[PDB]
Amino acid sequence: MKLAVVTGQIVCTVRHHGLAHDKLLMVEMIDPQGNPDGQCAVAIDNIGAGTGEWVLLVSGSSARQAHKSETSPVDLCVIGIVDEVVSGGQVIFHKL
């Protein structure tokens, strides 16, 4: 499980039917401190995260489960939006 920032959005009209009508968001991995890994990816989204918001990503077979079921053709899925990250009385990230 990893933290990531939603950097944007991808649009595929012709797509695999098992993606339903869920958003495909451009996500860029970060350290929990907030350090871009350069690592880019596209994550399916059914929670409803917007760009700039920090998200919690699950990959692999859990990414399938998290999206819907084992049938899902996904290897990367957003399972949470971050409200804040604290570090002993200090809020290093907060959602606005």
Q: Which residues bind its own copies (CB under 8 A)?
A: 1-3, 7-16, 18-19, 24, 26, 28, 31-33, 38-44, 47-48, 51-52, 56, 58-66, 70-77, 79-89, 92
Amino acid identity of residue 9, one-letter, is Q
65 binds Cl ion, rule: CB under 5 A: no
**9/62 with CB nearer Cl ion:** 62
Residues in the chain: 96
Q: CA-to-CA distance for 47 and 41, rounded, in angstroms? A: 17
Candidates 28, 70, 72, 14; CA nearest to 46 is 72
Q: Identify residues 9-48 at the interface with Cl ion (CB under 5 A).
A: none
Please report, as ranges, the residues that interact with Cl ion according to CB under 5 A.
2, 59
